[PDB]
Nucleic acid binder design. Sequence first.
DNA 1: AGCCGTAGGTACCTACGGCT
DNA 2: AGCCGTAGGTACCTACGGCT
Lengths: 189, 189, 481, 483
Amino acid sequence: KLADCSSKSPEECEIFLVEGDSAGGSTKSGRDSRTQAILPLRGKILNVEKARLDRILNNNEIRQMITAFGTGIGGDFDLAKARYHKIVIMTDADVDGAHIRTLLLTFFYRFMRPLIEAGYVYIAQPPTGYKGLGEMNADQLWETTMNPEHRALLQVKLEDAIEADQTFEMLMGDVVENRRQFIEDNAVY
Amino acid sequence: KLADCSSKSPEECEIFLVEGDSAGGSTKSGRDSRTQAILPLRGKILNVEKARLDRILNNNEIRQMITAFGTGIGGDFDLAKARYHKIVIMTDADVDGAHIRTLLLTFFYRFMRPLIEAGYVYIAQPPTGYKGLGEMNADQLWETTMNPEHRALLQVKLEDAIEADQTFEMLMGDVVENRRQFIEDNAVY
Amino acid sequence: NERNITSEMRESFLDYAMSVIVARALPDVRDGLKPVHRRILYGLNEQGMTPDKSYKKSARIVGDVMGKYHPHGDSSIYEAMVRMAQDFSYRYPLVDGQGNFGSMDGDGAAAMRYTEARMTKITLELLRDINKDTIDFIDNYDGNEREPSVLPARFPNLLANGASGIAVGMATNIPPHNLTELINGVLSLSKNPDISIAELMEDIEGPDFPTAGLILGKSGIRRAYETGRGSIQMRSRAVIEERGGGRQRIVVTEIPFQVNKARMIEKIAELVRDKKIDGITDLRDETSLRTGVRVVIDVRKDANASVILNNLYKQTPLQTSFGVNMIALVNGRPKLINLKEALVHYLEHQKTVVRRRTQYNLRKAKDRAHILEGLRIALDHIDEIISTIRESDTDKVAMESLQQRFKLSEKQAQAILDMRLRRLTGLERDKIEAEYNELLNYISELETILADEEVLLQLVRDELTEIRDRFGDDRRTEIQL
Amino acid sequence: INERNITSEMRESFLDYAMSVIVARALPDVRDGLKPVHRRILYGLNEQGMTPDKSYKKSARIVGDVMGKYHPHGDSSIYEAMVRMAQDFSYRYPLVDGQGNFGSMDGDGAAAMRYTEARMTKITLELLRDINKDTIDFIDNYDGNEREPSVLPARFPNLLANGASGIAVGMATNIPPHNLTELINGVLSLSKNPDISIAELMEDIEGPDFPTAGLILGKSGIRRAYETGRGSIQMRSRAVIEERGGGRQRIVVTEIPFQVNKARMIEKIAELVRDKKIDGITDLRDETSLRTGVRVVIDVRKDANASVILNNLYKQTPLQTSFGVNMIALVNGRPKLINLKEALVHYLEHQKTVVRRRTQYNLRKAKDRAHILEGLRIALDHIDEIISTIRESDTDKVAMESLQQRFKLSEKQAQAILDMRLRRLTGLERDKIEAEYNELLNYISELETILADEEVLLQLVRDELTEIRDRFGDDRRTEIQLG
DNA sequence: AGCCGTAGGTACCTACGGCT
DNA sequence: AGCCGTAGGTACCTACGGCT
Ligand SMILES: NC[C@H](Oc1noc2ccc(-c3ccccc3Cl)cc12)c1ccccc1
Ligand SMILES: [Cl-]
Ligand SMILES: [Mn+2]
Ligand SMILES: [Mn+2]
């Protein structure tokens, strides 16, 4: 359920992970099919900080990303096998798109950390407001979010890796109390 | 998908084939679960007058009815193994419910003819004012259609079997021209 | 640009978590509702889907809600609406359904295309006076509509229907209660701000499940009402009875709240099959619309049926606990609240609602009196009025002349210019005068209410008592000592 | 009465279903080109004021409204029908204006109905124009709670313009779309000559005009279909052969046949290559983009003959495909194979009826209004006496009677006077009444001229059609090659 | 063949917390 | 374990006729 690009040159290729089958369709029309691949996700994906390894590797969503990236995972990870030099996370600009984005970053961080370190991981920036990806036209998704000439990407930088581990464990881990304390402290209701 | 009854006495047991998953749920609440079994059908079912035996026997709906009836099919039919002595056809009172009813009777005629001859096959009569089965209350379905005290079932009688063959072949068979000629002739009606 | 991964995780997670807490999973202490429920009922109101009017197609109701107020999947909306129609889920059902709305067997509802819905009578009480400036409106998600921030909630719906919601970093689990008991509790609190939990429990004995059953003991109830947390032991109503030939059976006629009946039977069947329970010869669901819930367990002759039953309580949902965790939005912030807190916030809400209703009614009456004083002037001097209008070339000139010549306001002048000729008949003249006279008395009554805090509070009591008398019913769950 | 003969049941049940699918599901009406579901969608958009000037509405609201008031079938039936009306590769003249992913040529579906938004296109206003002036007969909806149009006014020939396809029971329909300028020219020609032949009409209407452009091979299939209503028409992709350097070549396809799924056509070529059933292809790429349009590239092996490869592709792949014309539509509440001239004749008959009824309604409405103004003028001329009569009366009923006896007013005139607001007594209003009355008498006469002369009415139809042609008619896209 | 287009369709992924 | 209730969800049987 990947729509791959024409070029075989990982250096100029980008893969967009788009929330929702509906936004998926739009992004395939809009894209440059030469250099831009599309991988749509149903919705919420596995939280790997909370699942067992057996379950992680059996998960359809996860398997599809691993295959698409082509780098392998964990020990067997090889940066030089990467099929795209840009992995772009593209979610709705809303609170659920936010969540999906944390789920995805958790996955990259715990299973493909070097991809972040290498600067291959990006976040797209669709127009902000009430409208999600599924409601946008193909040409407008291109103009605002996918076109190299006008789009604004954020590159995902890893800085302090001790700080990142503690952060991933606090927000996504199984200890509810540390999560609840973070929310209360930073809440701005 | 079968919701069977309690009694194992096929002589006092009835199975209702109900159009639609939605109507199916309703009839399970409403029924008498001692003597009344319910088997829901998704929608339009296979036209066996047009399909070959491989496809017929691979069809989930058909398999479920065959298993439920317990009589086996065609040559191997045994009336004595009937699990219900009333098979009741229960569709919406609309043109699609009509069609489903024709599809069902075609199936019984071609594969379970003796079940008709034995007078086990009936047609329920839900309230004819524009509403489908999916919009009725459970008590309503009970009162009008399933309760032996008030319900009017029609027993389906086979009379002239030559005339029945020609009818099944003309309306449900592969030759369109004979079907079209029937519609033209009777359209005034 | 560049984004630090710690910062993004922190910001993105907190965006999500905050949203789920204040705008998805937790009910508001004032009306007992989560966003989705509020939007459904408001929608039913805005479509005039009242009990007197006939039902509307669910898909219309849901499509309307999703478009105007709730930008989420329609299954979210439809399923929430379904639960509000089920008398085994809602102690006081908020939606009146037409069609298969599901059963205790966990049969889903019929598809949205088939089903129809309106308000129940009690739901009118949640909505009553929503259009008299009782509650604050806010902008919808897209800026194209207005939606209520809270409902007037003329009965205590949080505790009456209860709530359950999984959020982030917290969940909520509030059992339903009996409405007569609740309203007596609110009345007692209104007469005594310093009432204790123990005193309140003279009115409110404990939860009252839609599905009846038994609660064992007062001590989990006590802890939950005092602290907002507590475990409550629920049992089915079961009896042992003879079936003749000297054999016995257990008959269950009530099962614990939120237990799937079909599933509980399968669990029993599996215990029997896997030989983990001794003495059962037969298991049948004889439940019907006509006779109600009836599950029969035949016991082997000479086996001790009481021992079998005690086993079933140990090994099956036939006995089940309800873990109380009363977390609601208070002021937009999440909070673990005890019983007295829940009731205090509800009574505060009622005072605010009734006060604002009284003030709105007062302003609206005075505006209307002011218009009628102009019509009366016009009728008293009708010839002059007509002369002034005929002498004027334009509406603007007529307006100005009516204002200068009869000392009328702009609003009064407009109203006179708007009056139709048929208003000059005798019966119409008398109507204007009679409406004015009634309105002056009405205004006076309203002013009395806003002048005395005690009178206003009494008005709240009186209205609650009216609701208690119309909608209050018998306890169903038995609390055994 | 509790026994049913199986033959009778089958015959009755089947014929109920068959007749319903023919008249009430699968076949378009020859008058407006629509099937029940499409008619309900458009009428719904009208009845919800979802016009082009107004902003888009959520699809789910549009669909829920339709399924509830007019169309008692699943929502997916409704939404899918509405989606196709918005797609410029399905509709030669799109009826719906979509906001969101409304699908592609690859058979990518639309976004779910919760994601999408819709209103009328401008041309759709032409289908609905005059619906509220007693032009068409209304009927009871399915449940008796509503009224729905039995046919739309259809101020342009929408059956032939957007075409139709339907599988019914006992037959099907397959009508290709056409160019609007051509159609209207043909209706004009027919209106001037009832005895025009198919050959002459084809001087205007050269052949189908697909939204997706492409080529049609030869006039012979077209001719047979327009003469008899049945015919096979060979549609071919627009392909060229071009150099790609190092003296190698490629085939470039930029237009494909109507209703061919692009993605699936590519798959078929890929399969032919893989299974070695075609010689000389080295590469196959879809270079289609929103920027450059459809572009499929087929690389040819050096020194292979590219024209031979292309001829093979037309023979062995949907790159060439036929459209089997079978023009069955609605003629008086029945499915009827019709030729080109018949389709146009029923359309022009509908237009004449629409414009006649519109003129008659306007005339009734003008006379009723004149009648009210005649009373208002009387009232203003005697205003003191009018007011005094009203003041002396106890009740509405009494006032009505007094006004009617004293000033020779009708019931309606008296009502109108009692309804008059005081601001209508200012000084310019007497003259306003007189202004409106004078134009209305003039208007009445113009309308009566139209109802008096078949020829004047018919010219009015021509004039309106020509205006539509000038506003909406566009260039031919499909090239008919004399091949 | 299998696809065209309106009809009678439907299963089952995940997050989240607290109970068993 | 796996349920509970709001969220981001999903893929696919059937009739019907024509292709010639
Ligand atoms: N025109 C000749 C013939 O007409 C019919 N064929 O099948 C039909 C089925 C029904 C009716 C009808 C009659 C009365 C009321 C409602 C109905 Cl729908 C007419 C015809 C035909 C041949 C070929 C193609 C199309 C049509
Ligand atoms: Cl005992
Ligand atoms: Mn979203
Ligand atoms: Mn139906």
